[PDB]
Amino acid sequence: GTSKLKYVLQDARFFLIKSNNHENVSLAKAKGVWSTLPVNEKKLNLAFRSARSVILIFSVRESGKFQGFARLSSESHHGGSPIHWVLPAGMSAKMLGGVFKIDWICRRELPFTKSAHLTNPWNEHKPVKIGRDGQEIELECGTQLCLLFPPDESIDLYQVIHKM
Ligand SMILES: COc1cc(CN(Cc2cc(=O)[nH]c(=O)[nH]2)C2CC2)cc2c1OCO2
């Protein structure tokens, strides 16, 4: 069903997260963590305090797809286990902010062709696939986008609900 998912998404905030490669999304899916540049770290920490759920919707650059979505379970923190992010040439790990813990809601992919009818008011009503890393997605567009993903029957939202 979709009812627990709708409950988790109720009054949520949504952010488009771009990854340079599949390797970083794979790491995030395996370890339940994400990290970003300080500009987006500040936005996400503010959002985490502001709303019952903050949803990150992931898209690997040039893949033509979203790779899933996850809920922030923490603000960013430093000093944990280093994550061997495949950083681009020239970016040290020190350029990153802290690490956010996340709980995956859907690890299935969604092609951009399936979201062509959804526009994001916070990015000039451009198709929701279009946006910089960290672009906020307005509630209604973000909710409908998440509802387009194939159901992920491997995940049980019971434990997620208890964290709200
Ligand atoms: C494009 O190369 C980059 C790689 C990273 C490593 N990052 C993936 C990631 C990619 C991204 O685009 N945005 C993110 O927040 N994270 C892992 C820490 C999770 C961070 C970057 C970045 O440029 C903007 O900051």
Straight-line distance from the first to the last Cα atom of the chain, in angstroms, rounded to the nearest whole number: 20
Range of the domain at 52: 1-164
Strand 33-35 to strand 68-72: parallel, antiparallel, or no bridges (unpaired)? unpaired
Atom of ligand 1 nearest to the CA of 86: 6
Amino acid symbol at 138: E
> How many angstroms is it from 19 CA to the middle of ligand 1?
6
Amino acid symbol at 92: S
Q: How many domains does the chain contain in total?
A: 1
- Quote the DSSP letter at residue 86: -
Q: Taking a C-beta distance cutoff of 8 angstroms, is the pair 52, 73 a contact?
A: no
Q: Phi first, then psi: what are they for 27, rounded to 5°?
A: -60, -45
Q: Whose CA is nearest to atom 9 of ligand 1?
A: 19
Find where tokens 């946006």 sit.
131
Amino acid symbol at 75: E
Find where tokens 């770290």 sit.
41
Find where tokens 């502001």 sit.
50
